[PDB]
Design an enzyme around this catalytic site. Sequence first.
Site, PDB file in Angstrom:
ATOM      1  N   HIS B 136       0.834  -1.187   0.000  1.00 55.06           N
ATOM      2  CA  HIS B 136       0.000   0.000   0.000  1.00 55.06           C
ATOM      3  C   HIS B 136       0.870   1.238   0.000  1.00 55.06           C
ATOM      4  O   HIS B 136       0.788   2.097   0.874  1.00 55.06           O
ATOM      5  CB  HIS B 136      -0.915  -0.048   1.226  1.00 55.06           C
ATOM      6  CG  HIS B 136      -1.941   1.036   1.275  1.00 55.06           C
ATOM      7  ND1 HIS B 136      -2.881   1.115   2.280  1.00 55.06           N
ATOM      8  CD2 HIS B 136      -2.169   2.093   0.459  1.00 55.06           C
ATOM      9  CE1 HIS B 136      -3.644   2.176   2.081  1.00 55.06           C
ATOM     10  NE2 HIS B 136      -3.232   2.786   0.984  1.00 55.06           N
ATOM     11  N   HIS B 138       2.488   4.716  -1.664  1.00 57.22           N
ATOM     12  CA  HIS B 138       2.210   5.889  -2.472  1.00 57.22           C
ATOM     13  C   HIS B 138       3.535   6.371  -2.998  1.00 57.22           C
ATOM     14  O   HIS B 138       4.359   6.851  -2.228  1.00 57.22           O
ATOM     15  CB  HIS B 138       1.578   6.993  -1.615  1.00 57.22           C
ATOM     16  CG  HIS B 138       0.144   6.749  -1.248  1.00 57.22           C
ATOM     17  ND1 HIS B 138      -0.909   7.309  -1.942  1.00 57.22           N
ATOM     18  CD2 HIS B 138      -0.410   6.032  -0.241  1.00 57.22           C
ATOM     19  CE1 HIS B 138      -2.048   6.952  -1.376  1.00 57.22           C
ATOM     20  NE2 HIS B 138      -1.773   6.176  -0.342  1.00 57.22           N
ATOM     21  N   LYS B 219      -6.174   0.064  -8.969  1.00 54.22           N
ATOM     22  CA  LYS B 219      -6.518   0.635  -7.694  1.00 54.22           C
ATOM     23  C   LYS B 219      -7.621   1.617  -7.824  1.00 54.22           C
ATOM     24  O   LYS B 219      -7.476   2.638  -8.495  1.00 54.22           O
ATOM     25  CB  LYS B 219      -5.422   1.332  -6.927  1.00 54.22           C
ATOM     26  CG  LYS B 219      -6.085   1.887  -5.679  1.00 54.22           C
ATOM     27  CD  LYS B 219      -5.201   2.632  -4.752  1.00 54.22           C
ATOM     28  CE  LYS B 219      -5.866   2.788  -3.412  1.00 54.22           C
ATOM     29  NZ  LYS B 219      -4.966   3.308  -2.414  1.00 54.22           N
ATOM     30  N   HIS B 221      -9.802   4.343  -6.116  1.00 57.91           N
ATOM     31  CA  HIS B 221      -9.711   5.210  -4.951  1.00 57.91           C
ATOM     32  C   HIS B 221     -10.713   6.335  -4.930  1.00 57.91           C
ATOM     33  O   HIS B 221     -11.061   6.911  -5.960  1.00 57.91           O
ATOM     34  CB  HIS B 221      -8.303   5.780  -4.821  1.00 57.91           C
ATOM     35  CG  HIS B 221      -8.116   6.631  -3.607  1.00 57.91           C
ATOM     36  ND1 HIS B 221      -8.814   7.802  -3.404  1.00 57.91           N
ATOM     37  CD2 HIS B 221      -7.316   6.479  -2.527  1.00 57.91           C
ATOM     38  CE1 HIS B 221      -8.451   8.336  -2.251  1.00 57.91           C
ATOM     39  NE2 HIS B 221      -7.542   7.552  -1.700  1.00 57.91           N
ATOM     40  N   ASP B 223     -10.739   9.537  -4.024  1.00 52.30           N
ATOM     41  CA  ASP B 223     -10.425  10.797  -4.674  1.00 52.30           C
ATOM     42  C   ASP B 223     -10.585  10.777  -6.168  1.00 52.30           C
ATOM     43  O   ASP B 223     -10.765  11.822  -6.798  1.00 52.30           O
ATOM     44  CB  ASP B 223      -9.028  11.245  -4.267  1.00 52.30           C
ATOM     45  CG  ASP B 223      -8.984  11.717  -2.817  1.00 52.30           C
ATOM     46  OD1 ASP B 223      -9.525  10.995  -1.942  1.00 52.30           O
ATOM     47  OD2 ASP B 223      -8.420  12.806  -2.558  1.00 52.30           O
ATOM     48  N   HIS B 248     -10.190   1.621  -2.182  1.00 48.42           N
ATOM     49  CA  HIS B 248     -10.419   2.599  -1.128  1.00 48.42           C
ATOM     50  C   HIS B 248     -11.871   2.997  -1.208  1.00 48.42           C
ATOM     51  O   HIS B 248     -12.291   3.729  -2.110  1.00 48.42           O
ATOM     52  CB  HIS B 248      -9.538   3.822  -1.338  1.00 48.42           C
ATOM     53  CG  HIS B 248      -9.676   4.854  -0.264  1.00 48.42           C
ATOM     54  ND1 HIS B 248      -8.721   5.042   0.712  1.00 48.42           N
ATOM     55  CD2 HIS B 248     -10.641   5.778  -0.032  1.00 48.42           C
ATOM     56  CE1 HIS B 248      -9.089   6.042   1.495  1.00 48.42           C
ATOM     57  NE2 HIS B 248     -10.251   6.506   1.065  1.00 48.42           N
ATOM     58  N   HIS B 274      -6.531  -0.459   4.347  1.00 49.33           N
ATOM     59  CA  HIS B 274      -7.040   0.103   5.594  1.00 49.33           C
ATOM     60  C   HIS B 274      -8.511  -0.184   5.791  1.00 49.33           C
ATOM     61  O   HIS B 274      -9.336   0.723   5.900  1.00 49.33           O
ATOM     62  CB  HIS B 274      -6.790   1.621   5.648  1.00 49.33           C
ATOM     63  CG  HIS B 274      -7.251   2.361   4.430  1.00 49.33           C
ATOM     64  ND1 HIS B 274      -8.530   2.243   3.926  1.00 49.33           N
ATOM     65  CD2 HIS B 274      -6.603   3.225   3.612  1.00 49.33           C
ATOM     66  CE1 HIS B 274      -8.649   3.000   2.850  1.00 49.33           C
ATOM     67  NE2 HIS B 274      -7.494   3.606   2.638  1.00 49.33           N
ATOM     68  N   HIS B 322      -8.063  17.302   3.849  1.00 51.71           N
ATOM     69  CA  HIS B 322      -9.488  17.498   3.586  1.00 51.71           C
ATOM     70  C   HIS B 322      -9.969  18.931   3.768  1.00 51.71           C
ATOM     71  O   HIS B 322     -11.059  19.281   3.315  1.00 51.71           O
ATOM     72  CB  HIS B 322     -10.317  16.557   4.471  1.00 51.71           C
ATOM     73  CG  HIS B 322     -10.023  15.105   4.250  1.00 51.71           C
ATOM     74  ND1 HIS B 322     -10.404  14.433   3.108  1.00 51.71           N
ATOM     75  CD2 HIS B 322      -9.354  14.205   5.009  1.00 51.71           C
ATOM     76  CE1 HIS B 322      -9.983  13.181   3.174  1.00 51.71           C
ATOM     77  NE2 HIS B 322      -9.343  13.017   4.317  1.00 51.71           N
ATOM     78  N   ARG B 338     -15.679   9.336  10.408  1.00 52.77           N
ATOM     79  CA  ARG B 338     -14.551   8.638   9.797  1.00 52.77           C
ATOM     80  C   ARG B 338     -13.504   8.154  10.791  1.00 52.77           C
ATOM     81  O   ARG B 338     -13.009   7.032  10.670  1.00 52.77           O
ATOM     82  CB  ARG B 338     -13.894   9.533   8.735  1.00 52.77           C
ATOM     83  CG  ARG B 338     -12.657   8.928   8.075  1.00 52.77           C
ATOM     84  CD  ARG B 338     -12.276   9.671   6.800  1.00 52.77           C
ATOM     85  NE  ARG B 338     -10.906   9.377   6.389  1.00 52.77           N
ATOM     86  CZ  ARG B 338     -10.354   9.797   5.255  1.00 52.77           C
ATOM     87  NH1 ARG B 338     -11.056  10.531   4.400  1.00 52.77           N
ATOM     88  NH2 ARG B 338      -9.091   9.501   4.985  1.00 52.77           N
ATOM     89  N   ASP B 362       0.973   2.802   3.727  1.00 51.08           N
ATOM     90  CA  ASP B 362       0.230   3.949   3.218  1.00 51.08           C
ATOM     91  C   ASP B 362       1.129   5.173   3.260  1.00 51.08           C
ATOM     92  O   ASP B 362       0.705   6.293   3.549  1.00 51.08           O
ATOM     93  CB  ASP B 362      -1.021   4.179   4.069  1.00 51.08           C
ATOM     94  CG  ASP B 362      -1.967   5.185   3.463  1.00 51.08           C
ATOM     95  OD1 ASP B 362      -2.854   5.680   4.192  1.00 51.08           O
ATOM     96  OD2 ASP B 362      -1.834   5.472   2.260  1.00 51.08           O
TER      97      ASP B 362
HETATM   98 NI    NI Z   1      -6.372   5.070   1.141  1.00 46.38          NI
HETATM   99 NI    NI Z   2      -3.407   5.085   0.542  1.00 49.23          NI
END
Ligand code: NI
Ligand code: NI
Lengths: 342, 569, 569, 238, 238
Positions: B136, B138, B219, B221, B223, B248, B274, B322, B338, B362
């Site tokens: 995971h 990035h 993936k 996600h 976003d 995600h 996650h 955010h 959350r 992550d």
């Molecule tokens: Ni994520």
């Molecule tokens: Ni992530």
Amino acid sequence: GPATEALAGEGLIVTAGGIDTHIHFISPQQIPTAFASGVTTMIGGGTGPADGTNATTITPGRRNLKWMLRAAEEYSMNLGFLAKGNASNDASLADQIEAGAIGFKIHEDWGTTPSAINHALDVADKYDVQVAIHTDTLNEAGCVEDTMAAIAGRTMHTFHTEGAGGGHAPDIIKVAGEHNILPASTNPTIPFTVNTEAEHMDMLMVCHHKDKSIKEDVQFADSRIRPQTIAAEDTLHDMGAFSITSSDSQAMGRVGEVITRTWQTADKNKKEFGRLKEEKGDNDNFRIKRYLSKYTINPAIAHGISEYVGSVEVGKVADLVLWSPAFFGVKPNMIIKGGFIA
Amino acid sequence: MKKISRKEYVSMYGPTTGDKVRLGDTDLIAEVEHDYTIYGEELKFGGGKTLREGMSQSNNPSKEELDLIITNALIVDYTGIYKADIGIKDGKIAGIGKGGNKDMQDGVKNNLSVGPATEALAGEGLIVTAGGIDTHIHFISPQQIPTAFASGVTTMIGGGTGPADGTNATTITPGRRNLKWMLRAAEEYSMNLGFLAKGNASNDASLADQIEAGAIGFKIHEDWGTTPSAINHALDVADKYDVQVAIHTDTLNEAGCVEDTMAAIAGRTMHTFHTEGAGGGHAPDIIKVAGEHNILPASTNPTIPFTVNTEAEHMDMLMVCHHKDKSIKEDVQFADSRIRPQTIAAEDTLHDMGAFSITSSDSQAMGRVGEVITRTWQTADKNKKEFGRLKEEKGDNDNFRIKRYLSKYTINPAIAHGISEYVGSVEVGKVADLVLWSPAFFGVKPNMIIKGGFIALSQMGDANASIPTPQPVYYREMFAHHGKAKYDANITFVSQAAYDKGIKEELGLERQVLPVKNCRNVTKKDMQFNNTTAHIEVNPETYHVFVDGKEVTSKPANKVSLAQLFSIF
Amino acid sequence: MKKISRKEYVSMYGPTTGDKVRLGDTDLIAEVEHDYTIYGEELKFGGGKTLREGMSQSNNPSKEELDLIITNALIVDYTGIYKADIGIKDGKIAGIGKGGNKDMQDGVKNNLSVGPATEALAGEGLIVTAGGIDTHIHFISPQQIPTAFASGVTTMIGGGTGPADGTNATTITPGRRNLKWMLRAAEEYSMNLGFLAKGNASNDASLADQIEAGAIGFKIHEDWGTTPSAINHALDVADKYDVQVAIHTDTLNEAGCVEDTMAAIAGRTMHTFHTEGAGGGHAPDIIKVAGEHNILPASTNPTIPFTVNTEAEHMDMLMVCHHKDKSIKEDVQFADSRIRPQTIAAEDTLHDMGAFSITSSDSQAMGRVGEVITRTWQTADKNKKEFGRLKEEKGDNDNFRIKRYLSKYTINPAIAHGISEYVGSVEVGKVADLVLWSPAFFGVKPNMIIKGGFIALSQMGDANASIPTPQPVYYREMFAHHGKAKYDANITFVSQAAYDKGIKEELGLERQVLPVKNCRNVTKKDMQFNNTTAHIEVNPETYHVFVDGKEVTSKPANKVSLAQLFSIF
Amino acid sequence: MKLTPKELDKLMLHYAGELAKKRKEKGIKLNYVEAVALISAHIMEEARAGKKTAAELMQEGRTLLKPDDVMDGVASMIHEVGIEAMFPDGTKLVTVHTPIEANGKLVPGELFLKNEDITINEGKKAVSVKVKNVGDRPVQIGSHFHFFEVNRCLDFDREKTFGKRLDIAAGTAVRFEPGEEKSVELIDIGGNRRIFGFNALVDRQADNESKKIALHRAKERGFHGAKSDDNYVKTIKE
Amino acid sequence: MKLTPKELDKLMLHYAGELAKKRKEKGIKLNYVEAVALISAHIMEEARAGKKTAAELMQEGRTLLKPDDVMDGVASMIHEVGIEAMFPDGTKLVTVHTPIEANGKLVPGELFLKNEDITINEGKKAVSVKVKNVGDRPVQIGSHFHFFEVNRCLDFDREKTFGKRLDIAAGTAVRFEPGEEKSVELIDIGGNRRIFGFNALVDRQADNESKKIALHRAKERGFHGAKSDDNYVKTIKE
Ligand code: NI
Ligand code: NI
Ligand code: NI
Ligand code: NI
Ligand code: NI
Ligand code: NI
């Protein structure tokens, strides 16, 4: 002409790059260290921080020879590797050379026996390649007399001939007087300082797993770290008896102080024995060349690379290092590798 | 046949059968289950030791002669915890057993023969495990690699294009061009790599092209829009190309709730990142997914383990991110819908139960790519301290539980992404990605990292010293990290499709390139020591977690092991 | 989880753990040591059975999918006697365990996955063993091959050029040209092949050239002059090329006695054919060699087992051969100094003791290439009937002894000639040369011979019938015996040297060609279940055999099993 | 100021020591890293001052921290702290053995062996042999060395030790001081008993016949105890 | 002392903080770099001590410097100072929001907007719709999401919102707490009005005919408000 670049050298001293031939390829970080010290060529063995390597300067087998040759592409330093001579198997012996090794290395930890010694040497003769050796300290196979009989008069590069770095206890240092031998001293016990004896006992103990309460353990320590043969060294160099100065990096050697220490020793010996008989005129020129040769032209010859490097001469690769007289022998101005500033 | 005491023996060859080792400063005690050596013939390298010409080292080796032997190593793997020599040949783990010289020693398979071509590595007193596999990641900054590496991780799977917002938010390397950039960039590093593509698309053509381009999977996600459409489309193409899919969940529940997302998945395989929720996902019952059969539950680094500070910390990250405000109620609501402290604490326990299976990081986005291993063990330590030993545990040890967690960051992530055959466990035939651990520092700071059968990174001291031990002693790049050697030692993973299309020659890739396989026929039941399925509910009102009827939760902690004890920062 | 009786279960899946099978009409009883299946999930092929779409057969196989599964087979091998499914892929034994469909059945490794591409072979009730390996063949007539084949032998190693006197006398294919003829001829048959060259030469150059030419080893033979010179020279070159050497001792003792021959061998490895003496060799104490460490003892077919007729028979062969007369004393002397009934009977027992290790044939020259297996078991039967069970035997069975003899014509000959890695035992990774035996006919007449993963020969009935069972039922060539298929299924062995020199492309060889290896580092201690060494003497006067002080001998027999019961001739 | 890469290494270590101390100052139980750096930074300065000798710092380093200054576990951890510094006589290796003490429970990676004794070389019945070192130099033999071929100095019954090795824990050895005399245990070599290398006395299969050859060879090579040449009958190869 | 590369990162940061403080000591208006490092170095030590909790340091960091200690501009600059340190419970992310205050003029890169209001979605006449969240979980819709396909929980007149989106600033959203009920504005989608993806309710040209299909689909899929099936007349493709 308009194609030539200019480099000012007035006031500076130019010497060939140094050549350390007793390197343990324990960590690649050694290279930029040895380099910063005026050394442009490292010859040795190994595969990184592996125990075999920490103990011996050997890159065993053609596969591990491959890894290292391919790894070498990355660095700024001429390189050469030694293979495991600790084998009585002729086939395995030549294959490592056919694989890229510039020579063999017989070492105690791998078993420096008269068999291994004999076999290695023969194959070494065929492939016109060099052989280095670390004498049988424990005298298990025999004594220095036997090791010689094993060598049968053939050429040999003896590392740390003195003894501290390892070798026949306690008369290995005698070998450095024979005709067929290429005597080399290991960095650490050079020069002989009031602290060198204490220091070593520690390294030898921190290593080998020795104890103070065990007598056999205190015996070995005393049968190897002879303060007598140590001090006898500094003088042997001065006499031309010893010929090459190595390091023995990351294993009882400091790959960054070979040059510095070669000159320190020369300084001592002058301060204690004075100028030299051979000296001509009111200078130290002769003695100077004596030591320089110890880490340039002598290691170069001992490993068949004298034609390309090892001295400031026309036709050779341009591995030159500019020294600023004050910092001479310690910290150099710039290292030019292969005709270009590196 | 004279005999010797156990205290002695162990200072020469390390712990043998029935003996126990404490893992780092934790309470987890491991016990040597078996020993392949032959008391009296064990291998030792040194001045007058056993590994020498004609003796342990053969003068008549077998035509399989090893390139490297790790002597007397204690192997900790999901396959067991035992004593044995490890033989290494051609970048692969060639043998696990006695080994030495058949010419002078009984019982020595020829795949373990020691000859003049084999190097020696002392392992007595040390523990050997496979490299870790963080799935995971990035790809925000290349500096992460040497960090994850220093921590015992040899394989990173994720997505991205560097410090770009899309990457900071998601683990995705979009489009074949950006896939190219990254594959070609990867040549530079010391770490196996694999990339995930943008599954956030309902365009089948665009979906497969990224795989044909080199991606090991997709993936989906938030976003980018984790919708039931994108989800559905991605999965189908994923089935064709036998590649994996990570996801995600739709936190905002805009498209639907976790019920819908599942219906979208239609029972197909999925790697849930996650799964807990803090890292993101359906509010607030996403964590329930981690109990279904077709799901590959994975937890994200940060909320692990559950410490008295984790709740406060997160609220901050979620706010710093955010763009949330304290004065705005809708903003405080999202934050509370959350960052459920309830589902967080319920996590630590889910891992202990085998409910969760994989531990990620992550990195650079609510994850610490350097503490996956450290935290996986901290959690295990807590759960023991709070729940005690395990029922499955057999004997006076923690072996079983041990394997439970190890699998979480080795063999389980490896399977989840079709690269289990090559890496992911200390087994014969697999790539030799091994990391040597010094029992005291276990789980925190490893001794050395061997990549592809050769040493790539190790603790190293004063490069000028007369030995490798004197300070400073930090992690220095070794030989398999430089020149052309790195290429032989590393692997960039790709799909069968690309591999077959010649993606390697295509991009001038000098790295060993393998393809991922068997990603569509795996379920929660393929997760080693973490195959527990269950119908788990989640209270909408109290955000409380219930499993099989009962409810699970863990108590936070004020102190954790493998922490302040080992690092100056 | 309803349960079922043992009688039933066994008529569906065959014997399970703890059950026993009688081998043919012998007294040798084997016991199933383990079972990898999972009672309730066992594989069955048929009308409404288990191997069907979506069920046992997967619709989502692993990307390792098998090409063939032998269901519920009882594996008899030196590695054990157990129950398990055998998976076959790409001509190699890909897996030994459960296997089936992971989609619908617990515990099934992906190297055993059954998909639409895998074929089904029923093995329940049958016993599966590796193909036999006869290493003392005289390539006198090509008709021997289909004979040895029908008998469960898939690999023949020897020498010769056809019905030429040199060949009839010795197992040698002399010179590179004659090596060429034979290698190119071999393309035609269904049987792995390997050839031995003329070691009877003190010319090093001529010695290596035959290896460079394709030979897997040398053969020193009496008729060519087995002198200490030839012996010494051959061995040296044999050491270089890591190839094996076989030998036929100097009967006439002209150069020296067995003491000298040994001094000649200088402790190097050696494969001794018909070590007993009848087949030839130092008179009369050659049999003593079979007790030394560096020796690979092998017995020749004929004098095995020791029957009331064997002594009379031999005297005839030895007389019909050599040109001996009854009226000439020197002629009667040689006959009596070679056909010692004492050393003959001492043989059967030496095998039982693990003293002897390999069972050959010596085809068309004092050997029956079709009865090596049959006779190996007959002998085992006798020795049990006369000496009883074995001390090493564990439990109420003959398992141990069983493996003792099996190894004699499988794994032991395979090792003795460096081809153990590819063939010689039912193990994963090796070429799939398997032969299915129907328990009643075990050791005499096998059901079918699978060469290189495909069926090459099997019992077949009326080709016009509505089934394969109706008479006549003889051994008919199967598909792996024809077209280009034979090429994929067979192997001709060669030395590394030749293999490396491209001997394959050299001779237009369309057969799979492998090289032999690890022939110089093996000793009597490498012989499975036949590693017994010992100082054995032999009375010069009475030709009596003594071992470790005591003396060994067996009693002849009036009847043997696996004989008149099964063949019409 | 042409700073070597080695120099930078130390300059970094120093501020790791400085941090280490500054933390102890504030009164905080140091850890593994902090304790080590501290001890290292210290020795470094002392060598700079040119006062304390190498030998002295080895010890003085053991007084830089007391059991209550560090965290529990640190003691059992820092087995020793090696470090190099530049003395007026150049750089020297200072090893500060066990700087602090175990004033606590916690012991990272501690071992929980199980009192009992491992029986080495199972079923290999040893044999005792009188051995004396007639030479003027030491001689130490390894655990797996064909005993029959050790230094030609060690006098004893070579004949009796053919194909045998010192029945001791693998990797160890037996020392023989010049003059010393002892009786050693020695079992037979395992495996295929293929003796190649050493002194070249065997180089083949170790059997009773090779033995004859070995003794004959040692004899001519001067290996004390190597029986005698009661008229040798040379084989076709040796 | 196996120092991770992360550790070196911090060790460097610390001496950047140390410099920062030592400078303030001498009484010198710190700058952007100095202020940040300082705040960072501080928090780092505190976590080492194991006293202050993560939550506490978030604030305490806001008292390390006063407006007169820094240079003008620094305040308006250091919006916040994130930093990670190892607490007894492991590393945690501490974010010190606005550590110092704007006691001055100068404001780097400051903006000089021009009071006036940007008119969003020019000429796209909105429409209000009654929306209620009948589900037990929250539901937040984005600015450009085909409204007609949001969570099947939000009850309302689907028919009326076909081919429309929340008439709000691009990138924002509207939240619906379980139970909550509101009226949202929603303009028509621009561009080619090609709706693909979302819930798969359209996946084609958004027109009156596609609409029929959308409602029919939502209907069978259970999307509250999705009108009804007054007998559908399936087309040749849908
Ligand atoms: Ni994520
Ligand atoms: Ni992530
Ligand atoms: Ni040395
Ligand atoms: Ni050295
Ligand atoms: Ni014969
Ligand atoms: Ni024959």
